[PDB]
Amino acid sequence: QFPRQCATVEALRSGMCCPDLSPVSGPGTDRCGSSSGRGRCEAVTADSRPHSPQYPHDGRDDREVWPLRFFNRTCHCNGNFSGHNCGTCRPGWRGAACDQRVLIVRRNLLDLSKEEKNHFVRALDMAKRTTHPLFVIATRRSEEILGPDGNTPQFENISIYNYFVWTHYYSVKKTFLGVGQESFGEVDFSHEGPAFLTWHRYHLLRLEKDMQEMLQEPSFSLPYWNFATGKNVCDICTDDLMGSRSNFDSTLISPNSVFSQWRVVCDSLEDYDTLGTLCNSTEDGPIRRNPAGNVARPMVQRLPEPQDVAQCLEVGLFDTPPFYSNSTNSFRNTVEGFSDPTGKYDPAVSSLHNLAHLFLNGTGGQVHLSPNDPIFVLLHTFTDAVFDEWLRRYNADISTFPLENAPIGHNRQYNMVPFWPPVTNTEMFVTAPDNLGYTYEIQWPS
Ligand SMILES: *[C@@H]1O[C@H](CO)[C@@H](O[C@@H]2O[C@H](CO)[C@@H](O[C@H]3O[C@H](CO[C@H]4O[C@H](CO)[C@@H](O)[C@H](O)[C@@H]4O)[C@@H](O)[C@H](O[C@H]4O[C@H](CO)[C@@H](O)[C@H](O)[C@@H]4O)[C@@H]3O)[C@H](O)[C@H]2NC(C)=O)[C@H](O)[C@H]1NC(C)=O
Ligand SMILES: *[C@@H]1O[C@H](CO[C@@H]2O[C@@H](C)[C@@H](O)[C@@H](O)[C@@H]2O)[C@@H](O[C@@H]2O[C@H](CO)[C@@H](O)[C@H](O)[C@H]2NC(C)=O)[C@H](O)[C@H]1NC(C)=O
Ligand SMILES: *[C@@H]1O[C@H](CO)[C@@H](O[C@@H]2O[C@H](CO)[C@@H](O)[C@H](O)[C@H]2NC(C)=O)[C@H](O)[C@H]1NC(C)=O
Ligand SMILES: *[C@@H]1O[C@H](CO)[C@@H](O[C@@H]2O[C@H](CO)[C@@H](O)[C@H](O)[C@H]2NC(C)=O)[C@H](O)[C@H]1NC(C)=O
Ligand SMILES: *[C@@H]1O[C@H](CO)[C@@H](O)[C@H](O)[C@H]1NC(C)=O
Ligand SMILES: O=c1cc(CO)occ1O
Ligand SMILES: [Zn+2]
Numbered sequence: 199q200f201p202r203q204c205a206t207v208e209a210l211r212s213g214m215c216c217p218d219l220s221p222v223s224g225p226g227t228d229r230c231g232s233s234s235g236r237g238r239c240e241a242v243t244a245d246s247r248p249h250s251p252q253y254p255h256d257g258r259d260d261r262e263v264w265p266l267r268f269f270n271r272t273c274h275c276n277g278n279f280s281g282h283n284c285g286t287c288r289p290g291w292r293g294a295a296c297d298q299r300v301l302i303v304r305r306n307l308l309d310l311s312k313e314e315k316n317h318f319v320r321a322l323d324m325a326k327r328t329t330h331p332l333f334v335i336a337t338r339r340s341e342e343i344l345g346p347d348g349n350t351p352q353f354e355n356i357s358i359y360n361y362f363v364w365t366h367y368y369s370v371k372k373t374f375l376g377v378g379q380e381s382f383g384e385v386d387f388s389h390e391g392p393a394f395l396t397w398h399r400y401h402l403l404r405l406e407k408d409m410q411e412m413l414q415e416p417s418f419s420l421p422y423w424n425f426a427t428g429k430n431v432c433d434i435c436t437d438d439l440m441g442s443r444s445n446f447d448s449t450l451i452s453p454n455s456v457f458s459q460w461r462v463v464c465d466s467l468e469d470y471d472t473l474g475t476l477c478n479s480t481e482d483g484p485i486r487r488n489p490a491g492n493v494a495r496p497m498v499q500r501l502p503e504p505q506d507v508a509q510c511l512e513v514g515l516f517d518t519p520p521f522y523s524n525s526t527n528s529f530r531n532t533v534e535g536f537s538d539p540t541g542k543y544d545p546a547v548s549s550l551h552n553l554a555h556l557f558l559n560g561t562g563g564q565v566h567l568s569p570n571d572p573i574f575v576l577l578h579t580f581t582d583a584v585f586d587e588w589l590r591r592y593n594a595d596i597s598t599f600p601l602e603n604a605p606i607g608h609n610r611q612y613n614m615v616p617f618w619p620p621v622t623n624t625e626m627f628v629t630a631p632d633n634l635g636y637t638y639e640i641q642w643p644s
Contacts, residue, residue, distance in 0.1 A: 199333045199365065199616055201282040204269065205353040207344060213270035214239065215618075219283045230273035230284045237275035237284030242266065242620055245612040247602035250520065252384055259373040260340045261387055262606065264613040265620055267340055272619050282332065282619055289403060290635030292416060300417070301631060304579055305639045307421040307434055315439050318421060322572050323456040325358040325409050333618070335364050337478040339374065354479040358412055360463045362405045363569040367464040367477045368616050369397065369607070370565050374474040381471040387607030387615040389565070390523035392516065392599050394534045395585045396626035397607075397614050398578050403626075403634065404617065405575065419636065422583055423576030425554040428503035432489035432558070432573075440573055449488050449560060460485055462561060462570040485571050486560035498556035502549055506539035508643040510550060511588055513541045516598040522605060533584050551581045583638040586630045596627050 203209070203217035216239030221227035230237030244263045260267045275284035278296040287296035310318065334353040336343055343352055356364060369387035388397035406420045423434055434440045441455025451458040461484060464470075464477035490499045510532045518528040525531040527541040535552025537543045548556055554577050556563050562571035569575075601610040613620035631637040 199335045199356075199361070199368075200268070200353070200618055201332055202334045202353075203282070205334050205351050207349055207351060210268070210344065210351065213268075215269045215282070216271060216273050217283045219285050228283075230275065231279065235276060236279045237273045239271050240274045241271045242269065242613075244620075245609050245622070247609050247611075249606035249609060250522070250603055252522070253606040255373055255375065255382060258375055261369070261373075261615045264615045265618070280619075286407075289407075290633060300635050302417050302419040302636045303639050304419045304583070304636060305421055306424055307439060307576055308424075309639075310421060319439055319456065321409055321413055321418065322359065322575070323460075325362075325405075325412060326360065326460060328358050328412055329355050330358045330361045330408070331411070333361055335361065335368075335476070335479060337476050339474055339476065342474070356479045358408045359405075359569075359572075360479060360481075361408075362401065362575075363463050363567075364477060364479075365401065365404075365616055366569045367566050369614075371476070372467075372471045374471060377473065386605065389534070390536070391605045391608035392521055392530050392610075393604075393608040393612065393614065393623050395530055395582070396623040399582050399585065399626045400614055400617055400621055402575070402578055402582055406636075420575060420579045422579035422638065422640070423573065424580060424640075425557075425577060426502045426504055426507040426550070426580075428501055430490055430500060434573065434576065435487070435489055440576075443487075443489075448491070449486050450484055451487060457485060457572060460570070460572075462567055465567055465570075467566055487562060487571060487573075488559040489557060490559070492556070492559040495556070497546075498548055498553055498559070501557055502539070502553055504643045506549060507584060509539040510541075511584065511591065511642070514592055514595075516588075516592075516595065517600070518598070519600075519603075521600050521603070521608060529588060533581065533588075550584075551577070579638075582630075583640050586638060587640075587642060589627070589629050594627060594629055596624065599623070599627060 201217055204215035216229040218228045219231040229239045232238050244266050273284050278288045278291045280288040292298050292300050335356045336353050338352045345352055372381040372383045373385050374381045410418045435442050437452050437454040441451035441457045444450040444452045461481035463481055465483050492498050513529040517530045518525045523536045524543050526543045531537045532541050533550050535550040538547045538549055562568045562573050599610045610624055611622040
C-alpha cells in the first residue's frame with residue numbers, strides 16, 4: 199500500500215509519492231534522497247499491454263495499470279538503493295552505501311533450535327501487534343478515498359503482519375461496480391496465473407524485510423514448512439510452534455499458543471463487496487483451523503507426498519496458454535496446485551500449494567483470509583523454495599512468462615498489486631541467492 203507520507207490530500211492530487219529522506223533545507227528538499235546521489239522522483243512505468251479477455255471491466259477498479267489510479271511519479275532509486283524514499287537497500291545489500299552484500303538462509307522450521315523456534319513465534323506475534331512504521335491501508339476505493347469532506351483521507355494504521363494480510367486481500371478482492379450491482383469475481387491479481395509465484399515471492403520478501411527492521415535483526419530469515427511429507431496431520435501444529443488444536447473447540451488453536459489470541463482482519467466480504475469498501479484494520483473473529491478435518495472432501499485430508507515435489511520440478515515450461523488455472527504442462531499451475539504433480543489438469547485435482555491451504559480446513563484455506571493463519575508464511579516460503587529450485591535447474595528461463603494476454607495482474611511487467619514501490623513480476627524472476635540475498639537450506643527428493 200502507500201507510505202503514510204503520501205496518504206495525504208496534498209500527495210493524492212499531485213499524483214506524486216516521492217517523500218523526503220533527510221531534508222535539512224525544509225520539506226521538499228530531499229525527495230528520494232536526491233540531495234545525496236540516491237534517488238530521483240520520476241514518472242512511473244506501468245504495464246500497458248493487454249490482458250486476457252477474462253476481465254471485462256477496464257476502467258472500473260483501482261488495481262488496473264497499477265499504480266496509475268493513485269500515483270504518477272514515484273521515487274526511482276539509483277544503483278542499489280531501494281525503498282519509498284530510497285532510504286534502504288535492494289534485496290541482498292546493506293551498509294550506508296548499499297555496497298556490502300548479504301545472504302541469509304531460510305531453513306526448515308523443524309531443524310531450528312529450541313530458542314530459534316521460540317524467537318520466531320515471538321517475532322510473528324510481535325509483528326501482529328506492532329504498528330507498521332511505514333505503510334497505511336486505504337479503507338475505501340479512490341472515488342471515496344478523500345472522505346466525505348474531500349479532505350480527510352480514509353487510511354488507517356495497520357500492524358506489520360496485518361499489512362501482509364491486507365495486501366493479499368486487496369489482490370483478490372472482487373471488483374466493485376455499484377450498489378445493487380453484484381461485484382465481479384473472475385479476477386485475481388496474485389493467483390491462477392503466472393504472477394502467483396512472483397507476487398507471493400515479493401510478499402514474503404516484504405514481510406521478511408519488515409520483521410528484520412522490527413527486530414533490529416538484519417539477518418532474521420523466514421523459515422519454511424515442508425508440507426510435502428504426505429502425513430495425516432500437521433507436523434507444525436504444536437504449542438512450541440504455530441499451536442496445536444484446542445481441547446475446548448477442535449476448530450480453534452490451543453489456548454497455550456499465542457496464535458490462539460490472534461484475531462483476523464478482512465473477514466467481512468459481504469460488507470466490502472456490497473458497499474464498495476475495503477478491508478480495514480479492525481480485527482474480529484479468531485483463527486479457525488482443522489487439519490485433515492474436512493470430512494466432506496477426502497482428497498484434502500492428506501498433504502502432498504514427497505515425490506509430488508520431485509515431479510512438478512520435472513515440468514520444464516514455467517507456464518502455458520491460457521496462462522490460467524486450467525493450464526496444462528505448466529510448472530506454475532502445477533506447483534500452485536490446479537494440475538496434478540505431472541502437469542495434467544482435471545477440475546478435481548488439488549495438489550501441492552493448493553492442497554496445503556485446503557488441508558488446514560479453516561482460515562488458512564480461504565483465499566481472502568488465508569494469511570491470518572501464520573502457517574501461511576511457512577506454507578509459502580516452502581512454495582517459494584520450490585520456485586527458487588525450478589529457476590536454478592532451468593537457468594531462470596523467463597521466456598514462457600507471457601508479456602500480454604495473461605489474466606489482468608499477470609502480464610510479465612505488471613506492477614504487482616498493491617506493492618510499493620512498484621515492482622514488476624520480472625524482478626522477482628531471478629535465482630534468489632545471487633540476486634535477492636536469501637537461499638534455502640533444503641534437500642530435494644529423487
Ligand atoms: C479455461 O477457463 C476459461 C474460463 O474459465 C475457459 O474459457 C471459456 O470457454 C467458454 C466456451 O469455450 C467461453 O464461454 C462463452 O464463450 C462464447 C463467447 O462469449 C464471449 O463473447 C460474447 C459475445 O461475443 C459475450 O457475451 C461474452 O462477454 C464473452 O466474452 C459464448 O458465446 C458462449 O456462449 C455459448 O454457451 C452458452 C452455454 O455455455 C450457451 O447457452 C449460449 O447460447 C452460447 O451459445 C460461452 O458463453 C468463455 O468465454 C471462455 N473463457 C473466457 C475467459 O471468456 C477455457 O475454455 C478453459 N480452458 C480449457 C477448457 O481448455
Ligand atoms: C499526473 O498526475 C496528476 C494528478 O492527478 C491525480 O492522479 C491520479 C491519483 C488520479 O486519480 C487523478 O484523478 C488525480 O487527480 C495529473 O493532473 C491532473 O489531471 C486531471 C485530468 O486528468 C486534471 O483535471 C487536473 O486538474 C490535474 N491536476 C494537476 C495538479 O495536474 C496529471 O495529468 C498526471 N499525468 C499523466 C497521467 O500523464
Ligand atoms: C471496518 O470493517 C468492518 C467490517 O466491514 C466494519 O464493521 C461493520 O460495519 C457494518 C456497517 O458499517 C455493520 O453492519 C457490521 O455489523 C460491522 N461489522 C463488524 C464486525 O464491525 C467497520 O465499519 C469498518 N470500519 C470503518 C471505519 O469503516
Ligand atoms: C471444512 O470442512 C468442512 C467439512 O469437513 C466444511 O463444512 C462442510 O461444507 C460442505 C460444503 O460447503 C457441506 O456440504 C457440509 O455439510 C459441511 N459439513 C460440515 C461437517 O461442516 C467446511 O466448509 C470446510 N471449511 C473450510 C474453510 O475449508
Ligand atoms: C498512524 O499513527 C501515527 C503514529 O505512528 C499517528 O501519528 C498518525 O496520526 C496515524 N496516521 C494515519 C494515517 O492513520
Ligand atoms: O491461494 C490460496 C488457495 C486456496 C485454495 O485453493 O486457499 C487460500 C489461498 O490463499
Ligand atoms: Zn495466496
